[PDB]
Design a protein around this ligand. Structure first.
Ligand SMILES: C[C@@](CCn1ccc(-c2ccc(OCc3ccccc3)cc2)cc1=O)(C(=O)NO)S(C)(=O)=O
Ligand SMILES: [Cl-]
Ligand SMILES: [Zn+2]
Length: 300
């Protein structure tokens, strides 16, 4: 059959705290109709404020990706959107009782488990993909983010931290997500920060909820987390996780390759905005036969 749009089969709930705000938040994921996309909903407000998870609604990109509408924000959407992208979820309502998505364990692991526990549901409309037709890039200083054509979906990333826990380590990685490798390869890679920064961060209303329970905390000469890493390359894998979530602000799954070099949320957003304006560089495609498509998906 054709590759169909997907939504959630049943309502999913989670409780947590925002990484940056420290505020307790109740998360509710709900099914949504065809061509809704992912829409965030601030249900603590009356009337509610609904913000589509689209590039056009990105405000700040300092230490997270923040959606904005009116005076209202939804902060730190990248890890939940990475889970949505990784599982191929087209349509969903994401209700929040506060201004930031719960950080959970710092990865997309809890989200992919909660979603897959409930299950997905295929919808009777063709899934739409954005296919990269020619190279699109943005740079700022030594940072760079690039889309190149690729028959599938692949993400590569390189970091360069002038830090003794990073020097001499694997700071580059490439993952092919044309099959069902997202869950195994990157979903559990945790966010990370530096103990040295915590006073400055907190003064900016950042990392107020951060701890070893939801982040890899890096001290001057060692990782603070006593229990160890989930992957020897967990840092660069998390950057890949972030990129997948930020890229999903395009509103559809990508057929192409992303390469990040010391990039982050700000440059990811700039890349999407120039791609969207550069219309000859991309097209929208569907697949009436899943067997002939370049990306394959798990059963719902
Ligand atoms: C932007 C990033 C990273 C986001 N993040 C994550 C964690 C912390 C962060 C957490 C805890 C910290 O210290 C806790 C502490 C301090 C003293 C003693 C004990 C314990 C410091 C810092 C800060 C921060 O900004 C991203 O994942 N966005 O999606 S990233 C990886 O792309 O830089
Ligand atoms: Cl950046
Ligand atoms: Zn992250």
């Amino acid at each position: 059959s054709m590759i169909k749009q997907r939504t959630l089969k049943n309502i999913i709930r989670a409780t947590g705290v925002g990484l940056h705000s420290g505020e307790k938040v109740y998360l509710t994921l709900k099914p949504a109709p065809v061509d809704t996309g992912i829409v965030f909903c601030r249900t603590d407000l009356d009337p509610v404020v609904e913000i589509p998870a689209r590039a056009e609604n990105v405000g700040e990109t300092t230490m997270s990706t923040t959606l904005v509408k009116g005076d209202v924000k939804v902060d730190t959407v990248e890890h939940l959107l990475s889970a949505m992208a990784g599982l191929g979820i087209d349509n969903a309502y994401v209700e929040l009782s506060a201004s930031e998505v719960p950080i959970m364990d710092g990865s997309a692991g809890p989200f992919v488990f909660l979603i897959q526990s409930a299950g997905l549901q295929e919808q009777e409309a063709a899934k739409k993909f954005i296919r990269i037709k020619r190279e699109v890039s943005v740079e700022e200083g030594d940072k760079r983010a690039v889309f190149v054509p690729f028959d599938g979906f692949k993400v590569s990333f390189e970091i360069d931290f002038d830090h003794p826990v990073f020097r001499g380590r694997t700071q580059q990685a490439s993952v092919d997500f044309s099959s069902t490798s997202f869950v195994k390869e990157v979903s559990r890679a945790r966010t990370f920060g530096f103990m040295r920064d915590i006073e400055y961060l907190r003064s900016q209303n950042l990392a107020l909820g951060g701890s070893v329970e939801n982040a890899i905390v890096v001290d001057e000469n060692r990782v603070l987390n006593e229990d160890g890493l989930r992957y020897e390359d967990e840092f660069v894998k998390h950057k890949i996780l972030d990129a997948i979530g930020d890229l999903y602000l395009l509103g559809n799954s990508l057929i192409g390759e992303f390469r990040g070099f010391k990039s982050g949320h700000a440059l990811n957003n700039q890349l999407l905005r120039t791609l969207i304006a550069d219309k000859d560089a991309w097209e929208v495609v569907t697949f009436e036969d899943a067997r002939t498509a370049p990306i394959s998906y798990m059963r719902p």
